[PDB]
Amino acid sequence: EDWSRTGPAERVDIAIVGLSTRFPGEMNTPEQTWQALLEGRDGITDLPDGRWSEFLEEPRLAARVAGARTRGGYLKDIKGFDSEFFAVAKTEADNIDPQQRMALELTWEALEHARIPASSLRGQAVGVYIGSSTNDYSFLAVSDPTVAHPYAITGTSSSIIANRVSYFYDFHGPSVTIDTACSSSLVAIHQGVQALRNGEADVVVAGGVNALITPMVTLGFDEIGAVLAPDGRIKSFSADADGYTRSEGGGMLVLKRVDDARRDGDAILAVIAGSAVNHDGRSNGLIAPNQDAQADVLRRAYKDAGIDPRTVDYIEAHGTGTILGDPIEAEALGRVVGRGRPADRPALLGAVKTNVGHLESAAGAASMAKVVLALQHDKLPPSINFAGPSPYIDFDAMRLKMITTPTDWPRYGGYALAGVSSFGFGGANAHVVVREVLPRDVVEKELPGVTEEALRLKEAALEELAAQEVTAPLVPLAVSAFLTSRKKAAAAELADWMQSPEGQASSLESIGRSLSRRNHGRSRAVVLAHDHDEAIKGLRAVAAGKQAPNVFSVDGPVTTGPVWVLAGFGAQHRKMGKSLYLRNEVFAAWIEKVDALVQDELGYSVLELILDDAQDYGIETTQVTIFAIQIALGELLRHHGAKPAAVIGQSLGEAASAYFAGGLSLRDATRAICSRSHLMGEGEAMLFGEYIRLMALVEYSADEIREVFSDFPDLEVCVYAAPTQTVIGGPPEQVDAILARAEAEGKFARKFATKGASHTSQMDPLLGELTAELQGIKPTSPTCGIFSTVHEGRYIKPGGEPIHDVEYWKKGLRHSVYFTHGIRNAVDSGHTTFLELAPNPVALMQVALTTADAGLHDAQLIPTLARKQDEVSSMVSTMAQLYVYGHDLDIRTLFSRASGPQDYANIPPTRFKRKEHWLPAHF
Amino acid sequence: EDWSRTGPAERVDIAIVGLSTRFPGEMNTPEQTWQALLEGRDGITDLPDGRWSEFLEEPRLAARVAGARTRGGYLKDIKGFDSEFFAVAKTEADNIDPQQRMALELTWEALEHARIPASSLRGQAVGVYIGSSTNDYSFLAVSDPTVAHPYAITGTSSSIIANRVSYFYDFHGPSVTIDTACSSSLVAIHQGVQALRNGEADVVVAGGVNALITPMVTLGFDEIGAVLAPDGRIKSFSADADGYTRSEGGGMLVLKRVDDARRDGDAILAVIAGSAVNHDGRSNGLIAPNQDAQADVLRRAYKDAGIDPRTVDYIEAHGTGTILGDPIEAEALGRVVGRGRPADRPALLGAVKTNVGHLESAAGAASMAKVVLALQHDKLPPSINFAGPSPYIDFDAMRLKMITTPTDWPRYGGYALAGVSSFGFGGANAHVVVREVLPRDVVEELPGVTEEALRLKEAALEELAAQEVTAPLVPLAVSAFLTSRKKAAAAELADWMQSPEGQASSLESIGRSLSRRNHGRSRAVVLAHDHDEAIKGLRAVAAGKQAPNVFSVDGPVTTGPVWVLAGFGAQHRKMGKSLYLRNEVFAAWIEKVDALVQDELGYSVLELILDDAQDYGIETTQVTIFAIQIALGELLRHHGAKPAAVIGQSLGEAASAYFAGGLSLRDATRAICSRSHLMGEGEAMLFGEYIRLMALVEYSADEIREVFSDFPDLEVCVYAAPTQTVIGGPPEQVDAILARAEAEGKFARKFATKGASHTSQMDPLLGELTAELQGIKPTSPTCGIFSTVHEGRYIKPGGEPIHDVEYWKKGLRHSVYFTHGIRNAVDSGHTTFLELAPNPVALMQVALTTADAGLHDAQLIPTLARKQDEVSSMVSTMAQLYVYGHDLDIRTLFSRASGPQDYANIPPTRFKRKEHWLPAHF
């Protein structure tokens, strides 16, 4: 229990990993926005259709709509919401919005652009600092003074804009709304940066929105004087300037600490070095700018960033196109930035306001987007509407050079640098210093190991592998949604895109990666493919509804976790786990660790037998090798994020089971399995003749056995495999007599010709030596609920008490195995998914029979590696199935870490079914 | 310039130095609030006479309003604003959102409660984080969308609530309005704390405000249908809980870094240690409280503070009074705060909502008052409306215990701790932990007096202690932004001082209280010894009648002062000795220059000052007057005075060199002794054929240039006035002009001086003056010099070195141009002259010259006099400097206050308000 104060908040650079735009004419993606900037577009139009259609009544308001300057930037389709995506009823979805629609959708788009799964942030400390300015839908919220509506407080409140975002996405972090007029987005970004720096949140969504709903604000802005341009365009720092115009839109940015963005392997677009914010006092008039105030903002921001303001290559300015504000801004800029510039290194001016207009509270977002895009495409957009340098600004006296044609970056200090300024009409100034990505923030600051023979055989095997065919790897394409119809439609779209030339030119692995870095919704589907044609066929199957040999698609998560069936009675095949050792590294490391342990215990190395294909097997070597492969498989699964919920183990697959439950540790499990195997080795080497036993898989139940031992009292029960079948072992004579009886009673019988007939009577001498060996292990509290087949199948609850002592390993070896009772108890406790970790799946048939008798016929049997199969593909299929059914699996960990934008694909984005959700408001 | 990545932020504790209040019931200072809390008053009332009165016109909404849950903590006087005080016009003032008016007034009240004058914060890094969750005045103001007024965007907006506060008070710091529903205040405070910890502000005014203007929001909040209590009394953590009611009223807090509060001298009311804020996430919807989030805020807050939550005493909580939310808050509290309590330790619980209601965005402002006020009076207030423990929450199970009667402070683990929690209805949660003030956070070669000086000082202190004490003169400083307001404030203060509480208060305490208030444009000062003199002076100020010790002014004097460093024959037997015995800065500087003069010639001037038997020769008088001038000016500059222009005379040039930045100290000492020893040696060796006897005559420059061929060896010594002139020459030609002017009608007052300077007689002496002024460095002056050496022409500030060896060579020979320099000062606006000598002799000449040049309202301030107590004289000069509007820090006139007994509850500032409201046609 530590309570000793947090610690200092170190000043660090803040990476930017995502970005999304809904600008009033620069279009709705950060690739359309870049095209519009690079070409140079104008988003100013007249009132589309009827947008004030509501206030267009009261026929005198109509006159002043056609009397006030009503041009500006508008956004098509303000009314639109996929209410079933965002889980809002029809009666509620119209009382919300429209700024909260834009916020909710822009958060999704920014998270998709950053390529972080939106489902990986639910239940995490993610701050949401959103800046809004006006509440004008609330007017529509109350239009009939004969009724009143609920849902109105949370529907059109201003705080609730930044709360709903935290609600829907389940963000447990500081969620506030900001209001500082025309600078809300920049101060919101500044506060997000501060929150990230003092460790309140790990990822922050920042930005701002703005919507134009009523003409009342425009009418009020009209009656101030000459503040609104008759033309409807904005020419910043030009000879001509007669006012700005008001636009609607919004922007969002996903901020992350630079170390966090390097560790998580994301692509950094640009870093923020520092920022500042202040007020301007007087400022003779509430809406009059100041020079010393803005110079103070610049100085504080650039001292926070730790850079020299005279090495800045570009300055995105406020530039609201005023004959009085612009000279003041230019002089303030030149007093700090253009102070000692040697007349040949001028700072480039340029304002995004000439393309989009004045975006109010979202203005600081829009500029930011530009400065980010120009810092990733390595260009500089030109500023439109510029006629000629203004009389009241002496450009060459300062270091200002208003660009007109797309230039390249003038790196006056080596790396690209920029500054974004924004000044509100209340007097709140903000300035953000945006750098470019740099090399400095992508680079970081005993046991008997393998023997000498192992090296030789490994060297031979690697060349033999490198002297074979060029096999096509198996790639999982993962499609997902929150419903089933959405998943089908998305699969159809992805299949269609995969056939066009862009889809055909894209590598399969890149498409798989881009799919694996998306949202993992409730409904999931996976298509395992080798080339494009197989992928298209499987995606068509998913979209239609049919099944396929290697295509999985379920409707909802399985409620209960898996049960790891640690099997391995008769699972050996001569090439046990050799391919995976060469072609997978975690498997090889865990195998070598187990080899070191086994070498310490017994003397020989499992790795030699595994790699070599000359020596065959035997009960000792078979058991130890199967245990080693089981451990390696379990750790490979748990390296990708798999977690057992219960564990059941049969015979030799018991010790490994212990390690997977927290009932022992790897060394103790190795102890137990090696001692056991050595005991059977020597015992079966000795006991023959008057001591020979046998085994038989007879079709007798637990009760049909209770009336069949009377004739042959000396037989015993080895394993209760299924509630139809059972392994019997006893004297040879009585064994063939029972086979003859089974033949004449309609009962299948088959002899297992294995010397090591354990669990019956041959181990009576051996257990004493066992007592000499295993004494000294330390059982601990089980972190996983074990279905003890040795204790007749009681669901020993996690965390209770150590249950793995020397008697348990003695009794389990001596007495019978209660597999079917344990499985029956498991299916009656909720579990439906069983995962068998064995070289060759043989126990899934027994599990299928037991679960079929127990009532549940639609189970989920998931096998590991098998014979005459590609082991890498088997592992991929097992992990894909785990992903589909809903269990713990990080799909992003399959595909390797990328290098650049060429390792991903331009897969189609998600779609929303937007319906007109508007309120009938008569004024 | 250096740009090297401003260092990190260090997690320090934030002191609260001020506080305001406009809660229901306690509509005033935080001393009525304490009475109402300790009394258990209920501020929840019904609908006032007319509250809405706008939408209560249509006979449809009227019935629904009449059948709604419309009881709550309604405030009186929402429509009253003091327009003239806040400089806004009329048509602008009816628009301004009442939330903005409330914030404007509460900021002033907080700055008064903290005892930090508002005018002292002009144009500095002052952050303004204000929380506000609604603007329903936009409905009324932007109603009638036909002919609506221009001012609705600037006026009734939300980003402007904090921006007007930053504007009016001229705060250059981060100003922002915050919106997180019912947690806004507790969030804003939190953000302010972070600012003070990363260096983006120095004093932060953080708080919240809320107002009920429209019933539509109330009727809507009634919906759902089961969250508004029938009666209205919020019963929190009780068996009965039928909802909550709305309220209005806000609150501010003046936050400072604890180091700043310690260093300045303010009284630390309480200390915030940590704060945290997060969101619920998804639990059961927006308006469904989640418990794991409400435990996480507590854990993060108490790890940010570094405080173990199992030692907190008071858990002032949300207490919304809902039948479901309160148990959830209880489990949240018991999981973190009361987890491991050794079973006595009943984690005393309380809520302020039961006295004032639910204040929405200002809720975190209400609780932060209750916890602070209690922390200032060392006693928990009772919490009303607690019938019995609720069935669903087991109080004794976790650690909980409701408080019902005024209870003393448990002090588990040492000091007093607390915790304020707010949980918004949108999902935002905030928790702030407050400590108690602690013993920490409040605490942490040139010879001097020689042996002979020590002995004489001991004798002088014996003599000083022999005589009894006399009442010290105390300046009472009244100020306002208008003449009428200052008059009214003076009248009210006099009425207060006639009252018994105003009769049992020490005058020093009243002065101290008045010195830490806003110093406006109109100013007035009354210097008094006892209460009746003060009362009569205050009545004179209110009436407008003049008085000896009363000073008053209608507006600031534009140009800066002029330090007339002069004096010829102003010496007497005991100058500069009484204030040396009753002031330590003056004494320190006297000894500082005494070391230098000991270095220069052979001896200490302080010995001459102490001993009263010394016969003041020319050399000794010159150096003593130089030392007195230096100490006087540096004492004046220690209190914040700053000369705008200096002008010397004779031996006044040497000190003007130091006070203009043209020279360092040792340079001025070298100059003054180089002059003095030479004159001292030279004067004795002069006789009948050699003495150039100086005498004053009453002939101006033209009237001496006319009659100058009559008198050959006579010469100008000092141009003193546009009519007078000091002349020097051989005695017979002196007497001849004296006698002729006697008949002509002129005045020939003769000087009995013997070391006659400003003559051709000094030519022999200049040879050693040349060699005794070497090694000094003239330096660029920091302010203008009206040098009398160079004819009197002005010299601009920050130019080139002037006081070189040749400059002093000219100064010791050629005539003094005092009168022309004074007239040149007249030319460029200057009106105030302050004369630094132990006797105001040059003031007469300056007065005559200013009368010549057309100034009849010329402010001429003498510093010291003879046969006048020197400390009283200095207090008078410094009060006059304050009065006229120059740069004097009046708060430094008094001593550091050791407790609340050192201040006086003087009447507060008054706001004369008028009704500003819009038409109600909605």
Residue numbers in the entry:
A (entry chain B): 106 to 550, 596 to 1073
B (entry chain A): 106 to 549, 596 to 1073
From the article:
Here, we report the molecular structure of the catalytic core domains of M. tuberculosis Pks13 (Mt-Pks13), determined by transmission cryo-electron microscopy (cryoEM) to a resolution of 3.4 Å. We observed a homodimeric assembly comprising the ketoacyl synthase (KS) domain at the centre, mediating dimerization, and the acyltransferase (AT) domains protruding in opposite directions from the central KS domain dimer. The structural model covers residues 106–550 and 596–1073 of the amino acid sequence of Mt-Pks13 for both monomers. The central KS domain dimer is resolved best, with local resolution down to 3.2 Å, while the distal ends of the AT domains show a spatial resolution of around 5 Å. Analysis of the KS dimer interface using PISA indicates a buried surface area of ~3500 Å2 per monomer. Reversible self-association aligns with a largely polar character of the dimer interface, which includes a small set of salt bridge interactions and about 35 H-bonds across the interface, contrasting with few hydrophobic interactions. Despite the disordered linker sequence between the KS and AT domains (residues 551–595), a stable relative orientation of the KS and AT domains is maintained through their extensive non-covalent contact interface (~2900 Å2 of solvent-accessible surface area buried). The cryoEM structure of Mt-Pks13 was obtained without substrates or inhibitors present in the protein solution. Our cryoEM map shows continuous backbone density for both subunits in the region N-terminal to residue Asp118, which clearly indicates an extended conformation of the ACP-KS linker sequence rather than a turn. As a result, the ACP of chain A likely associates with the KS domain of the opposite subunit (and vice versa).
Polyketide synthase 13 (Pks13) of Mycobacterium tuberculosis, the bacterial organism causing tuberculosis, catalyses the last step of mycolic acid synthesis prior to export to and assembly in the cell wall. Pks13 is an iterative type I Pks composed of a sequence of catalytic and acyl carrier protein (ACP) domains separated by non-globular linker regions. Sandwiched between the functional ACPs are the central ketoacyl synthase (KS) and acyltransferase (AT) domains, which facilitate the condensation reaction, while the TE domain at the C-terminus loads the newly formed mycolate onto a trehalose. Due to its essentiality, Pks13 is a target for several novel anti-tubercular inhibitors, but its 3D structure and catalytic reaction mechanism remain to be fully elucidated.
